[PDB]
Amino acid sequence: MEAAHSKSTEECLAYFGVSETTGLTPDQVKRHLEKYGHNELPAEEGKSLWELVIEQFEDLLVRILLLAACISFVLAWFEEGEETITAFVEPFVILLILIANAIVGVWQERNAENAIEALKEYEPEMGKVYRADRKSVQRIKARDIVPGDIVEVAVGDKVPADIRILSIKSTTLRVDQSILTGESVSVIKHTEPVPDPRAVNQDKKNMLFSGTNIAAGKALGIVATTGVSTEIGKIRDQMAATEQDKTPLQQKLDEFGEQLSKVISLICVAVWLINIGHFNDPVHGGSWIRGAIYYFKIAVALAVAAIPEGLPAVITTCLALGTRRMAKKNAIVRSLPSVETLGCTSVICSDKTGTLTTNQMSVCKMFIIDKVDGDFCSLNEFSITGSTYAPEGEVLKNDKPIRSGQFDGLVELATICALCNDSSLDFNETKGVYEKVGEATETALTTLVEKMNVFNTEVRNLSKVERANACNSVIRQLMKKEFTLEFSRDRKSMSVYCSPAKSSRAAVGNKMFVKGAPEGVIDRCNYVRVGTTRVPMTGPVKEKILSVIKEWGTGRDTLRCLALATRDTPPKREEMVLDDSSRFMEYETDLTFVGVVGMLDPPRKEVMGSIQLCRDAGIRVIMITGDNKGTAIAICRRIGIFGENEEVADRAYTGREFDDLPLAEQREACRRACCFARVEPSHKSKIVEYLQSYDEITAMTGDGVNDAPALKKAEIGIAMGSGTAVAKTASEMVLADDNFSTIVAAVEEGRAIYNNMKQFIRYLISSNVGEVVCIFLTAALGLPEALIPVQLLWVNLVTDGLPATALGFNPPDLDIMDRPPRSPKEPLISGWLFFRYMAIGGYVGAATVGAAAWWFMYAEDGPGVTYHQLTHFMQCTEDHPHFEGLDCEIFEAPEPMTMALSVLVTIEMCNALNSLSENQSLMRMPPWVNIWLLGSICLSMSLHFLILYVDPLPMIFKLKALDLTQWLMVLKISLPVIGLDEILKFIARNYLEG
């Protein structure tokens, strides 16, 4: 039944045609079970052993790299009897690399806790229903419950399905709806219909939602919806499909892969445009069965030269080290790519209760009557320090430490708070902190009495376990609580009947201690406490009291105010009907006013300063809470979201107010307003979505189950350490210390890491640019293979793979948190830098080829072979009278290819030094700052020498250890790339922007 809250109790029974007295018939259960299904959220584990491997090769650059491997494999059979020592190594290596990068990712992604499974923990196993089978209550499986079942719930039970309340058996039905609102405050329910068909969950006070637990009371109701048709089902549904969108950096890499395929499939064709002059002459020495292989030998040569392999290993390494670095800053990272994304955060959507606050009710203000004289009435106001449930704090009279035991009014005030209280305080020995037992608004009273200590009970020597209820127990020893007149809706108040300790039952001295809403209580007061004396409640007195409650109730404070009064002469114990709540108000009349306490969920001390740091960083903070707007706006003023006296008429909306706005004005409101209160779980994710339509990298912080849809939807989901498991499993990061200042340091790292990532991304790509040009020349000019598609691999894995990771330890800027967040669409290479790295790629491509061609023309151990005959390396064993010189097997020798490799390697060792900064010369900024970069380089060099000397290594790379004559030439070609960029750096900082 949709919108059962809008219909009456009798209208819901008619919808299913079920008797409230008997229940569903076994026939009715059969039909409903087939129609609506089982009351159960569908489990979901998308990650399987096979499907996690398939998605690894879904990358475009992987597909291109894969094909080459296939091609490499095909072109390995055909080989002579002098070079057949190695043939399958290149394809084998490509395949191995492909598997390794893919395999590592799975291990760093498969290890993920399923959020839906955690959500199903809020699904009870058993349920209590009434059916036509047996007259007694049947306890069956909760999944066997169907819409129409007459379900009974009691105190401590967990609500199985979304239920329309039929009858409340107890006086009141208190319900904890923290899974939907994020507030643990008990909600008093009723059976009256809620006319508004668009009312939110906080408004549906006649409904019982699945997953929630009964705080107190017994009730009977009818099932409205089951399974995914419930409010907790809507949470489950929003936690499916594409859980996380690609990071802005991944979008840049995906943009790179797309345009890279447009180039390789054009350059190969560009070479095809060149090879025309050879097809003219009628030659049958190289038909179509051999002349087409030349295009596949350059395709795989351009593939490994274009695709920046090794980069997935460098990024993963840098991100893994960044996690451990942030781990020491109490920041647990569950998703590595979210690190880069957090640095680009411009908007932080935050939760109020438990996140911005401590989720621990604290009484901070209280006043009693000072003196009364006619129209004059002064008060004794006090302030209480402490933001936790712990008995740590003092009472302040005009910001002075004054003992509460002196004031007789405070002695009676503490007495009421101790007795008229169904809750207690407990010290968790495992966690080492004080926790509440019962109602939060009641444990606050327990904590207050402990702080006050009106009888000066020596408690500084008691253990923390015994300290919890020390001062409260002292008061209990004075007054024996006979019984309590439980809370009523017609009263908005609660009283307890107490007799003096060690006294008869027919004795005189019993008292009733009342606690409730200020309006109703004060109106039922006819007297006023002045210390130990009593004066009549007059006009001016009542008005003065109501005035202060008005101030504490609304304003910069906005406190939950409770009035405290006692019945000096209560009815006799026998003349009080306890089975009738309608008579309780008459019992709570002729009261004597004592005092008023004010309580609130206090903000954390490190929040206001943190938000300011976010504002200084160019990041705005928005509050999205399920709490009421009144406290929401107040807390916003307390932490700096709103001004102390700023007009926020059009800067704060409720859930219902937000739903009334059209889609256009809703999207706009997310950019204007900063406070959204009394919202459903779906509202939070919708606000994030709207902000993501402005291309804003938005983050989400929370701790509750109702935050899960927003935590998942946002780019960076942040969960509190002392929060729910659902919140953690649906988040990217977890604040272990529960500090909001941790986020500031996390963003600082996120910006610092990316800047270092912004360097070796350029370093590896610029290397690949020089490799493509190198292959483009030798393929379209006539020269033999200068660099084979096997050497490049080791270059883009070990030679360049090490200095790239070494650039991840570059010293970050000092003004990194004084600059607004970078644009998500900001390109890595554009403008002058696009031309700068274009010249470098052309230099490396030229330098490399020249080196291999230097071993021919101007050589020392090579045959003088000029350019007029060097390009025709194919015509040697088939054309001798026009070409002979020396040996025929010289073009495919392991000597000139090593010369090109030695230059390429040495250049990248120099290019790594140029990649230390964007527009800062090496002369100005010392190259010896990063000791790690020198190190990567040295290791690589040795490796570059290790790959030469150790004979079983140049066997597969076709290399040769250069002598003094050949090496020295390398330094004379690679080194002037330093001065090349150096000028380019000077121009960009003297003609553009430094």
Ligand SMILES: C/C=C(/C)C(=O)O[C@H]1C(C)=C2[C@H]([C@@H]1OC(=O)CCCCCCC)[C@@](C)(OC(C)=O)C[C@H](OC(=O)CCC)[C@@]1(O)[C@H]2OC(=O)[C@@]1(C)O
């Ligand atoms: C590595 C091999 C090169 C040849 C290549 O294909 O990359 C291009 C291409 C894909 C882009 C270009 C390359 O374009 C060229 O260099 C033009 C080649 C013409 C030569 C022919 C003349 C005879 C990048 C490399 O140019 C240089 C000059 O820096 C910069 C940048 O790339 C980045 O910022 C790195 C992203 C990982 C991209 O414009 C990028 O495309 C866009 O999506 C970006 C944002 O990616």
Ligand code: ALF
């Ligand atoms: F703690 Al909330 F909305 F879940 F403020």
Ligand SMILES: [Mg+2]
């Ligand atoms: Mg919360």
